[PDB]
């Protein structure tokens, strides 16, 4: 019954992440399990749905770290970096903005800006959860190195 | 409660009145502080020809520095509002030079409403006097209509977000275009 701590949770997420999985950033670099443990803090993590082009809501674990937001899926009881619309599942916090989705109070747009921009439409469980996510993402972007 | 939803995207030169037009339509209030747009989206409803439609209003940057961001807004658009300002001949000249080639590329078969904004300035004495110093004058309706023909626009409208003149009609026309296959 040890109380939740963000640093310990990050170690746990990394431990459950598949060693063979990597996730692309927009600049072509990739991110792996080992990078989760390299001088990064966890600001927030929780379940979201990533709305694909086909309109399908894909369950992901979103993990907001010091300099990136990770989108992970499940496979064989382990995390893998999410595969949705061939978009980078590792989002740099530099120059990231967040916006409400005007017709869906549960959702938010994440828009990243060098190698071009990308837009993500993410669904939370409620308007309250949307506000929490947007606030945390904005704060992380503010203090991003 | 509208059972029909359509997507509208607005484009045109920086400062030509896009955000004010969208906010007057969606909130019935003119936003007095000018903040240049990076990306926003709004919701509004309209009843036209006895048909209730919900419009998603995708607001875009008029500034060229955000050219690479704009295509994030274009997918699956039902109607484009392509704007210029009636007090800025330069903004009309950018319609065929910049906005039309971009929209035809990303949205090839999407109907375009060509919209002249800030119609309240056309007969504003101060505006006319200052433009004349620069050998300019406000855009004339005939010039807007000619440009609409030159770019294959679905329609041509003028409005003033500031006075509300023509605003409802811009969006009635846009909704009719949005409803076509
Ligand atoms: N006189 C007059 N001024 C207007 C009207 N609509 C907007 N403006 C003024 O023009 C300025 C720019 O308006 P705005 O709607 O923000 O431009 P924009 O096209 O959205 O600009 P951007 O976001 O691409 S940089 C503001 O000072 C605004 O108050 C109008 O109908 N009449
Ligand atoms: Mg604007």
Author numbering:
A (entry chain A): 299 to 411, 413 to 444
B (entry chain F): 1 to 181
Sentences from the paper on this structure:
Value of the data• The Pleckstrin homology domains have long been associated with their binding to phospholipids. Direct interactions between PH domains and other proteins have been reported, however, structural insight into such interactions has been scarce. Although all PH domains from Lbc-RhoGEFs bind activated RhoA, the binding affinities vary greatly, ranging from an IC50 of 3 μM for PRG-PH, to over 150 μM for p115-PH. The overall structures of the two PH·RhoA complexes reported here are very similar; residues from the PH domains that interact with activated RhoA are well conserved among all Lbc-RhoGEFs.
